Design a protein around this ligand. Sequence first.
Ligand code: AGS
Ligand code: MG
Length: 404
Amino acid sequence: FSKKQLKVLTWWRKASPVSDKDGIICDGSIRAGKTIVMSFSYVMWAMDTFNEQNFGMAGKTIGALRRNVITPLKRMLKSRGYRVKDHRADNYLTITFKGKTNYFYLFGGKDESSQDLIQGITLAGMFFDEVALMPESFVNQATARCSVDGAKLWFNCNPAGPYHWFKVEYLDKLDEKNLLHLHFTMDDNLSLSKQVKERYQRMYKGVFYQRYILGLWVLAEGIIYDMFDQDEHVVPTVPRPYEKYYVSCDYGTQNPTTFGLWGLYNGVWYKVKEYHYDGRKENKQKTDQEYYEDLMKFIEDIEKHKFKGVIVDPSAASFIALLRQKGIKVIKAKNDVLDGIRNVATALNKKMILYNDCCKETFREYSSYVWDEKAAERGEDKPVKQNDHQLDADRYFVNTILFG
Ligand SMILES: Nc1ncnc2c1ncn2[C@@H]1O[C@H](COP(=O)(O)OP(=O)(O)OP(O)(O)=S)[C@@H](O)[C@H]1O
Ligand SMILES: [Mg+2]
């Protein structure tokens, strides 16, 4: 373990000069070993400091908490001699060690079970994985539940805007809450090679570099996909031998409706051609029948055994139903926005995707998709939802197929 990771494991112990504190904030870069030592240190602290008490562990969703935190935490605890009994249906664990036993309830920031349970339960310590991605209403409610004598608060996240509730309320008022704060760059994880560290550097440019590599709380302003480059990302519209295929779709009778034909060739997805229909501009809105008829004329040429399905947003259920009637494979897209943008940026940085030069509406949109300046100075990083109709399709595709 690194010096900073070992400070997370030991701050709470009796010999430590900082064991006074009411809690701890660990933030900074990706792949820095924050979550894994933080969650491991939390259970150690709890099993040592208490007996027969309730504890909380929160994530964006409970399934997120389970992927990032809970599954690798079990192998860690089981290996150190901590017996765990996971009660998967009821969302809590029973960790037990040297005659002592405690209870660790699992929470989601958005979940309905989690609002119901958190309001009533009375905890002796709370932990937050990806705290910036959680509602502030949730953490204020959950911190009040830490009523038991000698409770400690643990927070864990990557950076966001400098006007974000957690940065402004929790991190700037650090001495006011008597919280400890360690900040993790990627050098604080010794398990990474210098070869592997510099690979992660190449995945991010711009705001996302400063946030997810340097660990800085910097402001999302101006153009979103600034790293897009018509030198690097545009290729000629000349045929190629594509292995698999997809069609990505942003649907709207009300606004423009887009398709995009994506094709795999030499481990790179090419946006082969675009469909762009604006009902307002054309002054004739299209029906689902008319749109389905267009998707067929749009994929007439390609070979149906390679065509692997249509990625489409869940709020087009009128359209989704008709495609399944007619017998098309229809993937409900991973809708999450900031996570989709960040992943598309990575795809451009690494050239996982390229564009044929006939995606002319896509390039226009690349040069106008900008951050909501008004919202970003509240601590809410969002796109301005205007001329983002190809880019939403491109986002669904990249997020749904390319990334996990
Ligand atoms: N002591 C260790 N031995 C081996 N691998 C480790 C060790 N500490 C951390 N790692 C690995 O380092 C990587 C990052 O650890 P995490 O705790 O998941 O990072 P993180 O800081 O939570 O990253 P984000 O912000 O959630 S992407 C994982 O692949 C871990 O398995
Ligand atoms: Mg983490």
